């Protein structure tokens, strides 16, 4: 009846904002439904970050929908890391910053978008049971992230 969830992913992808959005319903860590949420720092921390993983029931592996590099780093860095420290714990893959992907003006001002179908193909590649695209800014699908997280750990 407890669920430790650890959020991981590159710098600036939106991990802390994701937790603030879910828990506080605002945009600048625990919940009860009928869930402990851990934040991490995503290279200086290579040795210390993994310490947070012990007894994790699920990982939220975030990458940014506006950043091809964070997309590439899921397979390059994060998967190898989680498999070393916590093989077998399920992964919910989250593409953050959905509000920016929607906005043509963002790419004029700035960035390479990741499509829903490409996020889905990455999901399959890493064996994640879930892939959710979300925006902490608009809050869209943020509740969905954590609802996936609980569904994927709880029996059935």
Tell whether residue 101 is a contact of ligand GDP (CB under 6 A).
no
Taking CB under 6 A as the binding criterion, the range among 47-55, 114-122, 129-137, 144-152 that sits at the site for ligand GDP is: 129-137
Per the DSSP assignment, residues forming a β-bridge with 30 are 36
Distance CA 111, CA 21 (A): 24
Residue closest to 22 by CA, chosen among 139, 134, 153, 148: 139
Which of 52, 67, 70, 96: binder of ligand GDP (CB under 6 A)?
Answer: 96
For residue 7, the SS3 value is strand
**What is the separation of C-alpha 101 from the centre of its chain, rounded to a whole number of angstroms?**
16
Interface mask toward ligand GDP for 9-48; x: CB under 6 A: --xxxxxxx-------------------------------
Tell whether residue 16 is a contact of Mg ion (CB under 5 A).
yes
Tell whether residue 23 is a contact of Mg ion (CB under 5 A).
no
Which of 6, 93, 135, 149: binder of ligand GDP (CB under 6 A)?
Answer: 135
* Annotated binding-site residue? 36: no
Q: Write the DSSP assignment of 67-110 as a string of letters.
A: -HHHHHHIIIIIHHHHHHH-TT--EEEEEE-HHHHT-HHHHHH-
Q: How many residues bind Mg ion (CB under 5 A)?
A: 2
Distance CA 51, CA 105 (A): 40
Rank residues 72 and 155 by Cβ distance to ligand GDP and give the closer one. 72
- Give the interface with ligand GDP as residue ranges (CB under 6 A): 11-17, 96-97, 99-100, 135-137
């Amino acid at each position: 009846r407890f669920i430790k969830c650890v959020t991981v992913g590159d710098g600036a992808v939106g991990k802390t904002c994701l937790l603030i959005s879910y828990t506080s319903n605002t945009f600048p860590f625990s919940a009860n439904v009928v869930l402990g949420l851990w934040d991490t720092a995503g290279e200086d921390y290579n040795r210390l970050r993994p310490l947070s993983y012990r007894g994790a029931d699920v990982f939220i592996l975030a990458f940014s929908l506006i950043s091809k590099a964070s997309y590439e780093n899921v397979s390059k860095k994060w998967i190898p890391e989680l498999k070393h420290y916590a093989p077998g714990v399920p992964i919910v893959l989250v593409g953050t910053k959905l509000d920016l992907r929607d906005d043509k003006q963002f790419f004029i001002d700035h960035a390479v978008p990741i499509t829903t179908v490409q996020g889905e193909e990455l999901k399959k590649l890493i064996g994640a049971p879930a892939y959710i695209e979300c925006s902490s800014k608009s809050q869209e699908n943020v509740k969905g992230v954590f609802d996936a997280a609980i569904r994927v750990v709880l029996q059935p």
